[PDB]
């Protein structure tokens, strides 16, 4: 047999906001009962760190255990492409497993944000679609949000990023609103957060006029 | 050990009786040590034998790639019959089994809306023509663009997204030169779905 190790990147919104906390997560599955206490070693560009909180064994229904270690990272380091390494080993055993992760390499490209009002044919329905097109960005790590008059909006869905011909990404975010709120003149805003934007943030408004 | 993958027929093939839909079972990572691979097809439990098998293929990583294709009936797929692929090989200690069928559920008609480019995009050399297709089920769908009867090629489509009402939506973006849009050419977004009358609909989009 043998345990498996998976490494997960922080959330884009966490890396692009100084006030939030980005976390790299290392997950070990298929740990047997009589396996020694799993130990973790974290490395940032080869340099070992020690500010990683490790969680206890979590029994799964397939009679294996699950162990999770979480490392807090600096926004500056992750956005500069530093390499994070998770070294998993049992206490005593010489076998060791390593996994690494880092940001996508490549030239960051600034996204272009366009807002599209609902089609004239959709006005007959009870609810209209507000469309936010975000194209031409790299890497694909991005966060899109909707809001109106300050408060966040709730009923929106965002497509996965699609790789475009020029090597950049684009996606669409669709906010569904009641037609009444669109005709009453309310202002809706599409917030985009990407590392290639000024202050990692831009915003485009959309209202009936 | 090797791995097996099972693919559904193309949505365009299942929505036109003039075309032929086929389920595709692909066996990859077969080692040259053992080239013998056996297929067994089942349609709602009943085994069939009318499926063909493409001969082996080389790979840049010193592996093989054998394919088996079963032709299905349009009514059989749209009714939800399960299709099973049982791959037997010496490289597999027990035969791998893969099943597939159309998503069960009440079909829902797609709404298609064409959206012209944003005013802010007119400052670029190319503009974006957007086709919103929402409220459809199942996710099997085909979206194409054409201008003045001839098909367009420079478009990309997002994968279907599960909306909160249990239906799917997607966007298709046709990229055209700003000149062509400004000259008044008519572009059409074609959508093919089983819940549509004649399985086909198209919405146009022009400057005036
Ligand atoms: C015993 O059970 C455990 C627990 O499973 C749970 O319990 C059982 C009983 C069932 O009920 C399960 O349904 C239930 O989930 C089993 O543990 C599982 O083990 C498998 C592998 O054997 C793992 O699969 C991997 O999954 C990752 C993604 O995992 C995320 O998303 C899952 C849902 O989609 C979610 O369940 C996971 O917890 C995890 O969630 C993430 O968590 C972090 C932090 O917690 C969070 O920040 C994230 O937001 C969150 N994400 C989401 C979406 O929620 C998947 O990525 C792996 O695929 C990679 O590796 C494959 C090789 O193993 C490879 O084939 C793939 O192509 C892919 O390869 C990667 O590709 C990327 C490209 O993008 C590349 O960059 C990478 O380098 C490359 N890596 C490699 C190695 O190739 C993989 O599929 C399960 O996650 C894991 N579940 C849990 C809960 O831990 C255990 O296997 C069982 N044991 C036995 C013997 O049966
Ligand atoms: C050696 O090389 C070969 C060949 O690779 C080729 O050559 C090398 C030299 C490189 O240049 C490669 O870049 C090049 O591709 C390798 O064979 C590959 O093996 C991998 C697996 O390791 C396969 O990946 C899977 O791909 C499927 C989708 O496959 C289609 O799309 C591919 C492009 O995306 C395309 O290349 C394929 O040919 C195939 O195309 C289809 O062809 C049929 C034929 O008629 C056609 O009808 C279809 O229309 C057409 N489709 C398209 C889209 O074009 C992908 O879906 C798989 O992901 C699932 O499986 C993972 C592993 O199980 C799992 O971790 C994922 O999470 C995911 O899980 C699935 O998720 C869906 C939805 O979420 C769910 O419904 C499923 O149930 C679920 N399944 C499971 C099991 O969980 C997977 O990524 C490659 O396709 C395959 N390449 C070819 C050409 O077959 C070989 O691996 C190499 N070996 C070594 C040792 O290196």
Can you put this structure into words, describing what you see?
The structure is a homodimer. Chain A is mostly beta strands. Chain A folds into two domains: 1-102, Immunoglobulins (Immunoglobulin-like); 103-209, Sandwich (Immunoglobulin-like). Chain A has three helices and 18 strands. The first copy, chain A, has helices at residues 12-16, 75-79, 179-183; strands spanning 4-8, 23-31, 38-44, 47-49, 52-54, 58-59, 65-72, 84-90, 97-101, 112-116, 127-137, 143-148, 151-152, 156-158, 162-163, 169-178, 187-193, 202-207. In chain A, strands 1, 2, 5, 6 and 7 form a five-stranded antiparallel sheet that branches. In chain A, strands 10, 11, 14, 15 and 16 form a five-stranded antiparallel sheet that branches. In chain A, strands 4-3-8-9 form a four-stranded antiparallel sheet, with no helix packed on it. In chain A, a hairpin with a 5-residue loop joins strand 15 (162-163) and strand 16. The longest helix of chain A is centred in the first third of the chain and has 5 residues, at 12-16. Chain A is elongated, with a radius of gyration of 22 Å. The first copy, chain A, starts with a strand and ends with a strand. At the A-B interface, strand 10, strand 11 and strand 16 of A face strand 9, strand 10 and strand 15 of B. The site of a molecule of 8 linked components (NAG-NAG-BMA-MAN-NAG-MAN-NAG-FUC) has 11 residues of chain B, from strand 1 and strand 2. Chain A: Residues 1-105 are annotated as: CH2. Chain A: Keywords: Adaptive immunity, Cell membrane, Disulfide bond, Glycoprotein, Immunity, Immunoglobulin, Immunoglobulin domain, Membrane, Secreted, Transmembrane, Transmembrane helix. Chain A: Glycans are attached at residue 62. Chain A: Residues 1-209 are extracellular. Chain A: One of its GO terms (molecular function) is antigen binding.
């Amino acid at each position: 047999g043998g345990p498996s190790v998976f490494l997960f990147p922080p959330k884009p919104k966490d890396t692009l906001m100084i006030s939030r906390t980005p976390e790299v997560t290392c997950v070990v599955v298929d740990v047997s009962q009589e396996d020694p206490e799993v130990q973790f070693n974290w490395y940032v560009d080869g340099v070992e760190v020690h500010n990683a909180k490790t969680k206890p064994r979590e029994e799964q229904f397939n009679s294996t255990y699950r162990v999770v270690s979480v490392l807090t990272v600096l926004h500056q380091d992750w956005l500069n492409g530093k390499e994070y390494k998770c070294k998993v080993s049992n206490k005593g055993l010489p076998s060791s497993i390593e996994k690494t992760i880092s940001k996508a390499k490549g030239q960051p490209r600034e996204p272009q944000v366009y807002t599209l009002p609902p089609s004239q044919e959709e006005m007959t329905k009870n609810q209209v679609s507000l469309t936010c097109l975000v194209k031409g960005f790299y890497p694909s790590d991005i966060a899109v949000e909707w809001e109106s008059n300050g408060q966040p909006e709730n009923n929106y869905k965002t497509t996965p990023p699609v790789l475009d011909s020029d090597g950049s990404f684009f996606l669409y975010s669709r906010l569904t609103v009641d037609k009444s709120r669109w005709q009453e003149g309310n202002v809706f805003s599409c917030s985009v957060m990407h590392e290639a934007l000024h202050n990692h943030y831009t915003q485009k408004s959309l209202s009936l006029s």
